[PDB]
Amino acid sequence: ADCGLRPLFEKKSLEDKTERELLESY
Amino acid sequence: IVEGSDAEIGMSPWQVMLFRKSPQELLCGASLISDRWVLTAAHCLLYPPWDKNFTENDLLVRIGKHSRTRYERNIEKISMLEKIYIHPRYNWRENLDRDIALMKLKKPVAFSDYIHPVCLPDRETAASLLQAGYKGRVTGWGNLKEGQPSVLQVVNLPIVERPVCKDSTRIRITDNMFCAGYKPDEGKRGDACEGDSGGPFVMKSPFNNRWYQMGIVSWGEGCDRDGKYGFYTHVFRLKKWIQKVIDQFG
Amino acid sequence: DFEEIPEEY
Ligand SMILES: CC(C)CCC(=O)N1CCC[C@H]1C(=O)NCc1cccc(Cl)c1
Ligand code: NA
Ligand code: NA
User: Which of A13, B12, B108, B209 could covalently link to B35 via disulfide, CB atoms 3.0 to 4.6 Å apart?
Assistant: First the structure.
């Protein structure tokens, strides 16, 4: 239900160092 | 993982470790998709060519791990398997077709900052995200070269066009598979390697900003060789069997 | 190579 949302990232609007790489590939 | 880098703490809270009780050691990668179900690669449990046939009693599941070797006190959780479920048309004989397995845990694991499940794709996300060039991310404790890191490794990898995938190998590729990696021309490299099998291939949906597990780490010929690619189990294709198994055995 | 899991498990 609340899957895919990492406590230490998405839930705090923090993002990891390379996720944007994925976003930009899309 | 080859040509990756250390995970950040909490980066991959769905990452699981299939652990050997005796003798204690990393056995495979795996994923948390519920407080009671871990998803992995069928060949991690059963691969007759190498006299691999593991049963529940034989294994331990360790969730929330960063360190490969260390026992992570107050952070990691280790669980006992209640039952192993392997795909009925898993092709260990030929090409590792339907290379997928579910492991029901004896007790639900407690979610935390270091432990949290990943979503499983729906047809639309899958339709939308599984595209040549779209990048996914795989995580694992496997060797770092065709070796053995201290912490969970991470590498982002572009999905590769089906004909390239097929043209790169002698193996009969199927629709339950997709391959991933950079071409020799693209400069960047990286790949899963030994000990990463069963680990998750994830993508982040730009539609709802959740992480979906698109693939399972299945097979490769060598690690990170040029002209070769990682082959991953197509999770959305085998989803029915997954719901079916959950929607009845718990 | 691995640090021993707690006996209890
Ligand atoms: C089609 C097989 C026979 C090729 C060798 C192979 O890679 N195997 C045969 C046994 C299981 C699997 C494996 O090592 N999986 C781990 C792995 C290694 C490299 C890349 C990936 Cl994506 C996964
Ligand atoms: Na071929
Ligand atoms: Na490669």
Answer: B108
